[PDB]
Design a protein around this ligand. Structure first.
Ligand SMILES: Nc1nc2c(ncn2[C@@H]2O[C@H](COP(=O)(O)OP(=O)(O)OP(=O)(O)O)[C@@H](O)[C@H]2O)c(=O)[nH]1
Lengths: 79, 73, 72, 175, 843, 70
RNA sequence: CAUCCGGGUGUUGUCUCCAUCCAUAUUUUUUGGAACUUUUC
């Protein structure tokens, strides 16, 4: 399916996302999955409060993701 | 099936989510889980707006779908 | 290394006392010894106790509600 | 060979083309004490390496060097032996299952081999006329069935009379 | 800048993905990659690249109507007329390409077309110096041979990941017409053969380290590539992955269930043949043999493919190629397999570390560039460099260093050149670049002047950072030149042009050595006939426009001996006595093999900077070397080895220590030259037996006295130790049909050396592998003698590995033997004849 | 299905997990699952009162997994 | 430098023959951790 391949193609670029938690994470993406797992670096979190933090490495569960936000050149990619 | 869903492709859509937020933009790619990809997106939390760009939603998060405008040339 | 279901298999043989946490409820926990289990992570606890430290006194749990399984 | 006035033993030979072979100047670079002597330096070497042995080349073309060396097997006595037959020449040398119905896709048909096919494979390795099934018509005088025969070594058996003829035919072709 | 780009953009033939995404991708260090392509003659290399090129580009401008259809393989990267006309790749040309993979995540790939002719191994070495990993392409018919072993040995030695491609599979089926049962077996044998030379790792059509292809025809396979594409649709995904593990070796499925048992019941085959080879054969048989109407049904039935009548209206070969390219889609099986086969962390420290000392310090924020090959493009000479670190941009002022200088390792040290432009190679065009980033390989304008051959490029803003920085080691080319040509111009007045040209040739051809004699003659060394021929062509045509005289092909000789000294200073205060000794062939071989002493491998003497205890341990361990002698190893020469050996070493070691470098400098000086022909010395060990030193050394023991004195003593020692001449020898790799064997035997006899080390039936083909050895001085024309005497059948390659100089027959110093001029020397003496002709040239 | 996740690089290293109910745990990563069930040793709660325990965390619960030291 | 024997293409008029994408209720999406209350602006 194409909605997963687009993700794999944004590996390397910087990504923004939203979780069921309520917070948004922003960073370079290293690995993804068909599940929608993620592996990122130099993340800059921002919760409901506005509280910023730093997280060196992160793994996720896709189930917990609401939606992603992806770079603009990834609209000319082949489907 | 999914015959109807291909018909929606490349139309500006109004998508309500479980959070209440509503995303808007064209539809580029579609899934069996209802993962939608949307181009030039704008949330309307409510007298509010934000510019995102390319957004990939999950199936869990989506509630309803509705066409805003016809397919663009 | 140690896979997850092989780790739980040790808790059956040793008959070790294990406290179980719940999914969306931090206020509640459980206790007891492990007789048996299955592929879907359902558990048959023996001499199980509901834990303010209000210790209230053989049951079965659904695998959907667990979070932590901890030795002693 | 023409340009350099060095014909191959089989080959035709022309006049020089470049006139002057006059300068034969003894010199330190050249001198026989200084040189080391082994090997003929046969004319074939000169043609093969026109910019190595053959000092001062002019109007010389760069020669093709080496084709991959083709081991094709063609059978010319019994057609009965199949298309895919190991020849004398070649050197000696409890878990998961899926429905039976699924199988290799192409192999509904029992045998790859066709009576027609064996010839077809042979054709693949054939000359200009045959290996194309689409051709434009040409005149009778145009065709040169004769041509190939001179364009090949005479061979040892033939008497001088035909070997000369072979060279003469080549000369015309070359010019 | 923009104007330049706009003109430039028109020139290049555009592409489907576009530059912007390909340019966009670059920033991630992990994204993108570097890959080199090597393999023996005509293995397909260039055409493999051509496949990728034709996938990528819509136009293509160059293609004829003829070539696009079928018969003539289109050649890309053969942009040199010489190569085209010669017909074999000579100088490597990169292609850079944004490529997709099975996952659908594209990466930028730098591809390098290296030449597979044995004389241009230097080119392969240059490519390897930059590439992360290597694709090694083997002809299914040819199998593997000595050069393949050499290639894999070096590749792994330098921690270059290796992925195999078995090419020309169609030939196995169409040329040899092998049965499927036997075809599999043959492939398996080949697979086995590669594995035995490899150590610590084991491939298999199931690890996806081996790819099956026909470049000519137009297809590439991995067992993964196939399963997903056609089988995968048929069956549940969970199960399928396993299918591949149950596909290779010893597995047969009877009817839904497959049992490792041989084939019980009736008709039987192992799976590879069942689901792969058989249908492949059917494709071949079916397309040529079958009525064109019949075929359509199968395409829709088996493949869901629909051809127009114009696709039928071709001919067997062009039709077949169309069909194979139709069915088997873009070569992403290849790309995907490459992608998931290399781990940066495992190799990378190791590969960087070997070129440079392990370190490492001041990582990041710093520019670093390795310059390997230089490129004679349409305009000027470009410099090819690997983005080791940081970022380059136009007009950037960059410091440049050359390795021999580096060998050596503040004000005066740093020359610099601004970087005028950076372009990205694409075979026949260059794509304009504003900036270059770490990972990628690029074309630089204007960095050329600083360096001949290799150089290391760095920018350092830090004094400690500068101190840390380690210069790249000189590239170690696979072979030594040996072949010797003497040049003079036809007209002496044109010398200046020749001189310029020779320097240019050194820049462009990394294996060439140009030396200048007293006489003004130019000694050129090159690897072999063809190599030198190409040099001469370019020299006369491309660079100089001067017609020149060329001599009679010779060879460099080496000096040696087989078993006391007295000596006197020009101002008789010093007196030197040094023993000269034959060395153990084992020792010699150990020295010739450039190594770190890894695994169980005897330590290379260039590891001498490690504790002498360790060095001596190796000598004692591997040779039973005398414990004093091992402890007294001073250094190696420019070649062999120096030992201290006398009571005065105990009497006045401090005094002696003061004179080591003067000795040390001299010895390289003295051994680099020689007493017979001013040529370098091999297999000789020297031992200082006595050294008298001037009373009260009133600045008396000067370098002016002892350096030449030492030199003299060496020469005397060699002479009295009974000197000999050594001659370099090639390894002759000959491929022939069996009945042509006797011919080959006679040729060997006739040449001089007449030595064949081995004869091996090439299992699976009607061919022999013949290994011999041949004296380079008797090699002139050897290859053509073979080709002609076998009537075009079979072929030869000469490769210098092991670099062993055999004793030249005759006694080094006897007057009597030789016979008059113009006569090949009698066998008893080739040593005496060799010296005099060389002696005269020296003076 | 059942894509066995890329947790090989975290094995035998310290972690900072987060779970449902805003509760989090430190531990040495011993083993992992298809469904991302985890085995942690030397488990310490983060209430800020840190209690040593000695643990198998469920897959569903997991929100994320971090690394303390690079 | 020319001649000579041939070839292709377009166009214009003619002639003959013929027609006018898989099926999963038990942990990463479609058989729910949901439900409910209250305070602040
Ligand atoms: N029969 C057959 N020959 C092939 C195939 N692929 C490549 N070749 C051989 O490869 C030759 C042309 O390939 P090139 O790429 O030009 O040669 P190359 O491999 O670059 O050789 P170098 O330039 O010396 O490396 C032809 O003469 C073929 O014999 C194939 O699929 N079938």
């Amino acid at each position: 399916g194409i909605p997963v391949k687009l993700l794999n193609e944004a590996q390397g670029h910087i990504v923004s996302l939203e979780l069921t938690t309520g917070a948004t994470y922003r960073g370079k993406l290293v690995e993804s999955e068909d599940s929608m797992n993620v592996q990122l670096r130099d993340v800059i979190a921002t919760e409901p409060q506005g509280a910023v933090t730093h997280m060196d490495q992160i793994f996720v569960r896709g189930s917990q993701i609401k939606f992603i936000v992806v770079p603009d050149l990834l609209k000319n990619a082949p489907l | 099936h999914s015959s109807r869903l291909a018909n929606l492709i490349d139309y500006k859509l109004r998508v309500l989510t479980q959070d209440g937020r509503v995303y808007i933009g064209q539809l580029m790619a579609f899934d069996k889980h209802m993962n939608l990809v949307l181009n030039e997106c704008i949330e309307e939390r409510v007298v509010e707006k934000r510019v995102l760009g390319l957004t990939i939603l999950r199936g869990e998060q989506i509630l309803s779908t509705v066409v805003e405008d016809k397919p663009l040339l | 290394m140690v896979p997850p279901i092989n780790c739980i298999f040790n808790f059956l043989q040793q008959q070790t006392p294990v406290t179980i946490w719940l999914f969306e409820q931090i206020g509640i926990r459980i206790k007891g010894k492990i007789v048996g289990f299955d592929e879907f992570m359902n558990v048959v606890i023996d001499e199980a106790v509901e834990i303010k430290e209000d210790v209230e006194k053989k049951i079965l749990l659904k695998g959907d509600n667990i979070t932590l399984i901890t030795s002693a | 060979g023409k340009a350099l006035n060095n014909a191959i033993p089989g080959g035709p030979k022309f006049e020089p083309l470049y006139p002057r072979e006059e300068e034969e100047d003894y010199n330190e670079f050249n001198s026989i004490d200084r040189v080391i002597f082994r090997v003929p330096i046969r004319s074939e070497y000169k043609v093969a390496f026109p910019h190595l042995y053959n000092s001062r080349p002019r109007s010389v073309r760069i020669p093709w060097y080496n084709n991959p060396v083709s081991c094709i097997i063609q059978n010319d006595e019994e057609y009965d032996t199949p298309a895919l037959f190991f020849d004398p020449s070649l050197n000696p040398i409890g878990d998961f299952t899926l429905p039976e119905d699924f199988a290799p896709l192409l192999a509904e048909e029992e045998e790859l081999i066709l009576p027609n096919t064996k010839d077809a494979m042979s054709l693949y390795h054939s000359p200009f006329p045959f290996n194309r099934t689409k051709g434009k018509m040409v005149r009778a005088q145009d065709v040169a069935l004769a041509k190939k025969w001179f364009l090949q070594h005479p061979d040892e058996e033939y008497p001088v009379k035909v070997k000369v003829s072979y060279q003469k035919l080549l000369k015309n072709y070359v010019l | 800048e923009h104007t330049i780009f706009t003109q430039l953009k028109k020139n290049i033939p555009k592409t489907r993905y576009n530059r912007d995404y390909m340019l966009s991708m670059a920033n991630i260090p992990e994204r993108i990659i570097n890959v080199g392509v090597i393999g023996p003659l005509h293995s397909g290399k260039t055409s493999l690249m051509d496949l990728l090129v034709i996938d990528s580009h819509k136009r293509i401008p160059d293609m004829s109507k003829n070539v696009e259809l079928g018969w003539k393989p289109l050649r890309y990267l053969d942009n040199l007329k010489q190569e085209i006309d010669r017909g074999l790749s000579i100088k490597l040309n990169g292609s850079t390409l944004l490529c997709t993979d099975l996952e659908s995540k594209s990466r930028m790939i730098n591809f390098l077309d290296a030449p597979g002719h044995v004389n241009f191994m230097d080119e392969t070495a240059v490519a390897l110096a930059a590439s992360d990993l290597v694709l090694i392409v083997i002809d299914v018919v040819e199998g593997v041979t000595f050069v393949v072993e050499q290639l894999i040995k070096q590749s792994i030695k330098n921690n270059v990941a290796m992925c195999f491609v078995i090419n020309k599979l169609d030939r196995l089926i169409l040329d040899l017409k092998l049965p499927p049962m036997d075809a599999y077996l043959k492939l398996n044998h080949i697979i086995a053969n590669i594995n035995s030379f490899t150590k610590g790792n084991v491939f298999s059509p199931i690890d996806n380290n081996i790819i099956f292809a026909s470049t000519k025809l137009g297809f590439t396979f991995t067992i993964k590539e196939f399963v997903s594409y056609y089988y995968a649709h048929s069956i549940p995904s969970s199960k399928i992955d396993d299918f591949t593990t149950r596909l290779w070796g010893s597995v047969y499925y009877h009817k839904g269930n497959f049992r490792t048992k041989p084939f019980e019941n009736v008709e039987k085959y192992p799976t590879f043949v069942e689901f792969i080879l058989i249908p492949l054969y059917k494709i071949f048989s079916y397309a040529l043999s079958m009525e064109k109407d019949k075929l359509k049904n199968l395409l829709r039935s088996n493949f869901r493919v629909n051809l127009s009548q114009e696709a039928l209206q071709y001919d067997p070969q062009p039709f077949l190629k169309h069909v194979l390219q139709l069915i088997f889609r873009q070569q992403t099986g290849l790309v995907d397999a490459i992608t998931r086969c290399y781990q940066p962390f495992e190799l990378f420290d190791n590969k960087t570390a070997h070129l440079s000392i392990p370190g490492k310090s001041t990582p990041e924020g710093t520019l670093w560039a390795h310059v390997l090959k230089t490129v004679d493009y349409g305009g000027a000479e470009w410099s090819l460099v690997r983005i080791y670190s940081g970022l380059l941009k136009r007009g950037d002022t960059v410091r440049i260093l050359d390795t021999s200088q580096s060998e050596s390792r503040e004000d005066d040290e740093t020359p610099s050149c601004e970087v005028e432009e950076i372009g990205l190679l694409g075979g026949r065009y260059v794509y304009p670049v504003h900036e270059a980033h770490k990972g990628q390989i690029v074309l630089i304008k204007g960095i050329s002047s600083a360096y001949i051959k290799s150089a290391t490029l760095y920018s350092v803003k830090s004094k400690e950072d500068m101190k840390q920085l380690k210069f790249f080691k000189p590239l170690d080319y696979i072979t030594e030149a040996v072949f010797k040509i003497v040049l003079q111009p036809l007209l002496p007045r044109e010398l200046p042009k020749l001189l310029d040209a020779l320097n240019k040739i050194s820049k462009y051809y990394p294996g060439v050595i140009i030396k200048v004699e007293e006489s003004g003659e130019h000694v050129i060394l090159g690897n072999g006939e063809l190599y030198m021929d190409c040099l001469l062509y370019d020299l006369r045509a491309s660079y100089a426009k001067i017609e020149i005289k060329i001599s009679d092909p010779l060879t460099v000789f080496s000096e040696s001996c087989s078993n006391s000294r007295l000596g006197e200073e020009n101002l008789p205060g010093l007196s030197i006595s040094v023993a000269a000794e034959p060395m153990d062939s084992k020792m010699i071989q150990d020295l010739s093999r450039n190594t770190l002493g890894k695994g169980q491998n005897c330590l290379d003497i260039d590891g001498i900077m490690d504790n002498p205890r360790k060095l001596s341990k190796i000598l004692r361990t591997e040779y039973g070397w005398d414990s004093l002698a091992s402890r007294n190893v001073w250094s190696f020469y420019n070649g062999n080895v120096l030992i201290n050996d006398t009571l005065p070493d105990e009497i006045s070691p401090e005094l002696l220590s003061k004179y080591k470098e003067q000795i040390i400098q001299g010895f390289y000086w003295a051994v680099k030259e020689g007493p017979l022909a001013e040529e370098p010395i091999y297999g000789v060990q020297y031992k200082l037996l006595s050294i008298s030193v001037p009373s009260d050394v009133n600045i008396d023991v000067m370098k002016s006295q002892i350096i030449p004195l030492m030199k003299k003593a060496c020469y005397v020692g060699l002479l009295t130790a009974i000197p000999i001449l050594l001659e370099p020898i090639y390894e002759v790799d000959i491929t022939v049909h069996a009945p042509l064997l006797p011919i080959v035997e006679e040729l060997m006899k006739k040449r001089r050396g007449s030595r064949i080390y081995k004869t091996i039936k090439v299992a699976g083909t009607p061919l022999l592998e013949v290994r011999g050895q041949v004296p380079v001085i008797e090699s002139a024309g050897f290859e053509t003698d073979l080709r002609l005497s076998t009537n075009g059948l079979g072929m030869c390659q000469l490769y210098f590995w092991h670099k062993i100089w055999r004793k030249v027959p005759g006694d080094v110093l006897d007057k009597d033997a030789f016979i008059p001029k113009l006569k090949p020397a009698p066998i008893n003496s080739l040593s005496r004849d060799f010296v005099m002709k060389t002696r005269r040239r020296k003076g | 299905m059942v894509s066995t996740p890329e947790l090989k690089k975290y094995m035998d290293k310290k972690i900072l997990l987060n779970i449902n109910g805003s509760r989090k745990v430190a531990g040495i990563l011993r083993g992992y699952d298809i469904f991302l069930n985890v085995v942690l040793d030397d488990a310490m709660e983060i209430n800020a009162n840190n209690h040593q325990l000695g643990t198998v965390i469920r897959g569903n619960s997991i929100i994320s997994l971090e690394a303390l030291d690079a």
